């Protein structure tokens, strides 16, 4: 009784994309499934449902035009054919299957992992990492600038300092380019006497950049 | 269509104790309601069906009542595995989620650590400007963060973003990006972070001068 | 030019305790600075002068100190007469005036009351939609306040207005109107406003249903 | 026995030209040296511009300088501020100070005048529209009902607001006026009583606004 969507996909405005449903451990065709996406910081949203037969399809208002759902039971898989997409598709895709009711009402038990669908469509491009040093207990930072697409992975001296580090969540720029931020605390006298090197690893752009911080004036 | 709506949007609580979220649909949509529950990073797992019936594998401590236009979620004893979102759904119409009601366990009030940081060099050779307000440390989560150019407001320029609650400390992080372009930036001589908390019993302001 | 800055921009106190302002300036304007008085709608009273010299006719309890940059304000015991917004003057490149440090007085902490009013039948026929969302008796002074139609928050849409302490509960009392226009209110049924303050430990938010 | 007595009142247009008269009396004028300083609402205070103990050497501010003029006269002991080509961002509280210490010499200010306002905003005066809150539930659940009245589209200020031609003087709270997008402004008047006090009693808010001259009192009904 579980459910496997796609793992990762990046696409463009207006593009096509799949993503694919496993179902498995339960019978299918019995039942009937639905698309749910959730936005980052938002609350979850119905996208589209389909019979536990396939003979109705049901669609939400804004999504009626550009999306189309379908299903095998004999594969047990269910796909959704995403066409014409927009920045406001850009959500984690959830594949679920009914808790109660047989083939007769849209409760939801079991959810799947969900599938993450990128329309950003912006070049890939290395993150810009530049230091924030300490004044005068002190603090100090580094700052990731202008880099695509998610993730971003950050860690002290190859991850030496793991204690008192805070990694803040990404953000959105009017220029749709991320720019995340990463800072540590540390007593005053052990500033001068030790090194702080932020690595910045990034796998699409393939940019890993070690910077280290001093406090210079 | 029909659009429901939750009460309480962040509710402080603590462990083993009675929890009491109210959703209203603003139609009658009878017995017909679900209640979910999310945790960060994890799929969403269903609490509660018809508002009367539970679903297996599920704890027995919460419970749900209500019918018609008023609902009602109940939990008698809360635990460690109670603190994520919680959305309320009703199938009489467009399929369709509350604004959710997230727990949290900042009981405990602290002052929030504010370190203000002028934007690198780097980035002043790339032409951009970063000024970067730091708050650190802090619970309760709720916050107020103003940029004061010159004794001036700056509104729309400022990025803020909040971490989630930390196990061991429970405490929450909170920065604020203000970015400029190189021309307003060296236009403008100082620089000035306000910060409004709960902790503080003065909000606490911290700033600087361009290029010292 | 210079242009000073000042620390808490809102301090609270209560009589007879020690008050401490700090308004530190850019540049060094040495030991030539002014500290001043403004009651609402009255004109402002010149406290002290040189920041070192009393200016006459002042209370003894005020007194500053500080050199260089660094300047403080420091009152030994607190009075009912002394509570006014207070800003302080530099003259010694460009004269101007900070953003001015105003102290009330804190003595409980209260649940703000809310009270969700909808738009009247006469202005609906103006084609002109307020709604009134009031929060009564509660401080501190300080709250915050969202705005939520059919789920989603409006930001620009909302204006704010606070009236001082009565002296009688000192409580300040907040009001917040949300203006647009007709169609946008019929389209939307459900409206709500929520509320922030620290006397509730749950946000606590007043709705309701078009018509 | 230094007294400042500033002009009362004034309104204009965009644009326009406006003579700000500061009188002084009680001490010697031509001693010492003058100087206007402005408040724009919920603002800081702003230096706008000072002239000297002869009237010579006249200073002014950046943003001021073009079409601003301070001028004094020794012989009447009178300060005129005359401005022309008024814009939005100089609608403020003008007043005419003193030096306190120096003579002459420094930037010092003791002795400031009453205050005089000058509106820019170049908008027609039109009568308040008075929209009644209706009561929000009969039930008492916050241990008093609330009731209020709304005045949108006045102008200018000010507008006074009694209830029961005063009858109803506790539990009011009177907020202050908002700038509005179409520049006309705006206030809000509320009042809590018990609910059982709500069948038995009419509530009534007279509306007072005195340049449109319209005085309007409207009842509270659900």
Redesign the interface.
Known sequence: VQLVQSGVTLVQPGGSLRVSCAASGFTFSSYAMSW?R?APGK????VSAISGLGGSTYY?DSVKGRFTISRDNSKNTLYLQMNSLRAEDTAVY?CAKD??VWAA??????????ALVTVSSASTKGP?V????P?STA?L?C?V?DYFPEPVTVSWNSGALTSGV????A?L?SSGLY?L?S?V?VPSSSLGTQTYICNVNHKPSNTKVDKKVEPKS | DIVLTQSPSTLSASVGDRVTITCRASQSISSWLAWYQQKPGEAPKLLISDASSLESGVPSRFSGSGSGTEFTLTISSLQPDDFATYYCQQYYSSPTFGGGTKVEIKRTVAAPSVFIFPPSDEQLKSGTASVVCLLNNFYPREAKVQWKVDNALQSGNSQESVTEQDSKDSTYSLSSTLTLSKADYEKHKVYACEVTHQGLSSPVTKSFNRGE
């Not at chain 1, 609350?43 to 119905?46: A, D, P, T, V």
């Not at chain 1, 009402?105 to 969900?114: E, L, R, S, T, V």
């Not at chain 1, 805070?166 to 969540?169: A, C, I, K, L, V």
Request: glycine share 12%; net charge neutral.
């Open positions: 749910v959730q609350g979850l949203e119905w939400a959830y808790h109660r009402g849209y409760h939801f038990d079991y959810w799947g992992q969900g810009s530049f230091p924030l040093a004044s603090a930072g700052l600038k805070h990694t803040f969540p953000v720029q720019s931020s800072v605390t």
